[PDB]
Structure 1
Amino acid sequence: PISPIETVPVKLKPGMDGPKVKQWPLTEEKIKALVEICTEMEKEGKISKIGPENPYNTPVFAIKKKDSTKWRKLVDFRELNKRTQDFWEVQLGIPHPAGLKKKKSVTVLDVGDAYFSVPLDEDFRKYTAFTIPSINNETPGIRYQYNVLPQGWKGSPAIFQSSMTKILEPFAAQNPDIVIYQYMDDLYVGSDLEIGQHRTKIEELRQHLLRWGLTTPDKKHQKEPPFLWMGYELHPDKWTVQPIVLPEKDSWTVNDIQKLVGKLNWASQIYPGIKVRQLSKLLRGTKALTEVIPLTEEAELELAENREILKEPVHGVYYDPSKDLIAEIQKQGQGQWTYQIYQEPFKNLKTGKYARMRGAHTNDVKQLTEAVQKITTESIVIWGKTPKFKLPIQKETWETWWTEYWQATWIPEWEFVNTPPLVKLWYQLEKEPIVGAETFYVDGAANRETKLGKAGYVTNKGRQKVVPLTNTTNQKTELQAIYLALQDSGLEVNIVTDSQYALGIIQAQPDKSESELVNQIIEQLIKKEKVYLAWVPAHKGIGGNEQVD
């Protein structure tokens, strides 16, 4: 009938004193409600009545509908939380259903209320002092302080989780035939034991927890499978996530949005394609921290877009550690890519999408590489290993690319899968000057003030041209010059430029750009048979006719 636990030493941030927020007026009704609740709590040892000597205070609320029960006591620890030391991160990552191995028997227990049975560090209790105002300011308010982890306090989640882990350690270690996982408030217990035996282990686990004064809600009778674990519906052979309905309203509060983004973040590793535009509002919304009403705009488009994706259910299989992980990727267009990770064909563990990183100039090979890295890291998180890739790029194209690219790059074990559209190199510059090919010496210049400029070329075969330009810069004209040489030359051409800027764009080997001019150059290079781009320092005895532009 006795019960013991160890407390975690807690401290306020260095240089800070406890909270001293004054208690505001409360109606006679709410006061009587609070007095009752507190009497009950004090009877269970959750709180203790203190004297007038404690200088700390945190305001208390009273709310709720009589439906479920009478009133509910709510203590706002905002100030104490700001003064409380930081704790180790409880989160850090969310378990993915496809990371689970198949188990014959599974049970999920709810330990969401057990935190209120964990004792609070004795020397920290005095900082949780609160006061219940008296009937009509005629008597000193009743003073209380917590003896257990408070509902909204900063250290409750982390202290509770570490306490639970310590209690479960001996049970798990002495029952290696069962697997125990704890996410926030759900306790997953799975095994390959016959149902009779599995139920026996569950009973023993609950009695084990009971020795520390930690109870688990009564038998929530229902048909299984499916087994519900942190939003996933677990079946013996597959798992499922039911469609996620997002709230429909025309007015949003900071709190509404935080819960929405929290739900989307969770669904992000489950569903392909999500959003982060509403975050911008949150950084400025929760920036003020105020739980007011942020006017939603444009986040409207992603919300309507997330809503559509979440309209569908997600199905997948479990992981078989005795088989290889395979990841296959497909180019969809517009810088979007899709991928499926599986072990057996058509039995996906995880499917998703990858959007290209924002940038001025890009290339399909660079994007495929990024997608591979992203998928690699995610796979290591979930399965602890890198999958074998099936990529829509020829082994020969890859070789040409990485051997010539100025940066170091690499892709892990992979095989070519012929699935259009295939990724390729659209153009390839020459390493040496082309014999017999006309040589174009190009140059450009603009007037900063007038914004007027010229771009032209002179060639070894006497060909020459100058074109006027308006509303341009030096860099603009440098690129126009190269573009002109490409337009007026044959299939093979040597181009000499003094533009380090242009050379820098082209050496990046873009096959697509946001800049109209660069895209035009790209289209031209694609049509050429051979192009050699040579650089020379400007303002010297080179080129010959740079006086024309």
Structure 2
Amino acid sequence: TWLSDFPQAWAETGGMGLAVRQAPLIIPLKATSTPVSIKQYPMSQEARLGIKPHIQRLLDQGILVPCQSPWNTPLLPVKKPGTNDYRPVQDLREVNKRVEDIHPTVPNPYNLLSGLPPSHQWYTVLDLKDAFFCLRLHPTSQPLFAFEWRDPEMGISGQLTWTRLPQGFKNSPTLFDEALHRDLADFRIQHPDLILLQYVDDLLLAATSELDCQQGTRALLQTLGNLGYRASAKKAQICQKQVKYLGYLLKEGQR
């Protein structure tokens, strides 16, 4: 039961993550950018009730905080089902347009896999839960991602914003990927034999013997939990010779 050996490493028992070694991120704007404030589109009580719990939880976790900002983007009530539960999706497109571009350093899955040697048949796959939220946003950049929120009967003043790298921000994947690479550089050095593939929040650890893939996995989980990241114990694929990774099925140095 790896779940018991490494409590801090699993989202199930380690609590929300926070990459303690990473300095809060500063988001540079384009040279000519000025704040854009888009009024919130009227939302139905149904959508609001559906979204409320999520907002409340984020506030209690400190991921969302009240604020007053010249920036504002609309919240979209998206129901994953065909007519069930909602989830808040923020339309950060006008903000993305005003933020300075950075080089896309995340390798496409195909090329990433080309780094998998035939010798390592034992793989481990971990998915980091709420990856972006583990990265802090510098207070000077937080106002950029503000949106409107209310409760027709008592509630928050008006706007809330993120204290962590938000979903929907064009640079979140790249910044997370680069941050985790910095945090796992030492681990790679301490395990010259192991093969560690990273695709934003999806990790594939490779090894020759179940002993390696096993001892290596223990070190990774311990390392991850220690750095402040959290993996999904639910979806975790430990020391297998066949696993699903990035939409592929790895089985015998194949796919």
Q: The residue matched to 2:184 in structure 1 has which SS?
A: helix
AA in 1 matched with 2:210: I
AA in 2 matched with 1:100: L
Shift of 1:97: 4.6
**TM-score with structure 1 setting the length:** 0.39
**Which residue, 62, 67, 70 being the options, matches 1:45?**
62
| Bigger fraction of residues in strand | 1
Shift of 1:40: 0.5
Larger radius of gyration, structure 1 or 2?
Answer: 1
**Which residue, 174, 194, 204 being the options, matches 1:158?**
174
1:200 equivalent to 2:215? Answer: yes
**Partner deviation per Cα, 1:437-472 (whole Å, 9 max, x = no partner):** xxxxxxxxxxxxxxxxxxxxxxxxxxxxxxxxxxxx
Task: State the match for 1:114 in structure 2.
Answer: 131
AA in 2 matched with 1:105: W
Structure 2 residue runs without a partner (length 5+): 1-7, 9-17
Higher relative contact order (CA closer than 8 Å, sequence separation 6+): 2
**Contact 1:131/1:142 (CA < 8 Å) preserved in 2?**
yes
Matches within 5 A, 1:325-474: none
Shift of 1:34: 2.9
Shift of 1:198: 2.1
How many positions carry a matched residue from both structures? 234
**Partner deviation per Cα, 1:38-91 (whole Å, 9 max, x = no partner):** 1100111211112xx422211012232579x84211110011000011012134
Tell me, in whole angstroms, the C-alpha distance in 2 between the residues paired with 1:171 and 1:98: 21
Over 3 Å counting, the alpha-carbon distance change for 1:97 and 1:167 in structure 2 is closer
AA in 2 matched with 1:191: A
**Contact 1:131/1:141 (CA < 8 Å) preserved in 2?**
no
Shift of 1:96: 6.4
Tell me, in whole angstroms, the C-alpha distance in 2 between the residues paired with 1:150 and 1:190: 30
Q: The residue matched to 1:49 in structure 2 has which SS?
A: strand
**TM-score with structure 2 setting the length:** 0.80
**Contact 2:127/2:235 (CA < 8 Å) preserved in 1?**
no
**Contact 1:23/1:133 (CA < 8 Å) preserved in 2?**
no
**Contact 2:37/2:71 (CA < 8 Å) preserved in 1?**
yes
Tell me, in whole angstroms, the C-alpha distance in 2 between the residues paired with 1:90 and 1:110: 20
Task: State the match for 2:204 in structure 1.
Answer: 188
Task: State the match for 1:100 in structure 2.
Answer: 116
1:146 equivalent to 2:162? Answer: yes
Shift of 1:112: 6.2
AA in 1 matched with 2:71: Y
**Contact 2:122/2:213 (CA < 8 Å) preserved in 1?**
yes
**Contact 2:122/2:241 (CA < 8 Å) preserved in 1?**
no
1:177 equivalent to 2:176? Answer: no
CA RMSD of aligned residues (A): 2.9
Tell me, in whole angstroms, the C-alpha distance in 2 between the residues paired with 1:224 and 1:140: 48
Task: State the match for 1:215 in structure 2.
Answer: 230
Shift of 1:176: 1.5
Tell me, in whole angstroms, the C-alpha distance in 2 between the residues paired with 1:66 and 1:143: 28
Task: State the match for 1:125 in structure 2.
Answer: 142
Tell me, in whole angstroms, the C-alpha distance in 2 between the residues paired with 1:114 and 1:197: 26
**Partner deviation per Cα, 1:95-134 (whole Å, 9 max, x = no partner):** 2655531113221222363122111232110111100245
Tell me, in whole angstroms, the C-alpha distance in 2 between the residues paired with 1:234 and 1:101: 12
**Which residue, 32, 37, 59 being the options, matches 1:20?**
37
Tell me, in whole angstroms, the C-alpha distance in 2 between the residues paired with 1:196 and 1:233: 22
**Contact 1:112/1:186 (CA < 8 Å) preserved in 2?**
no
**Partner deviation per Cα, 1:194-228 (whole Å, 9 max, x = no partner):** 31342232122112111232111115477943222
**Which residue, 86, 94, 105 being the options, matches 2:101?**
86
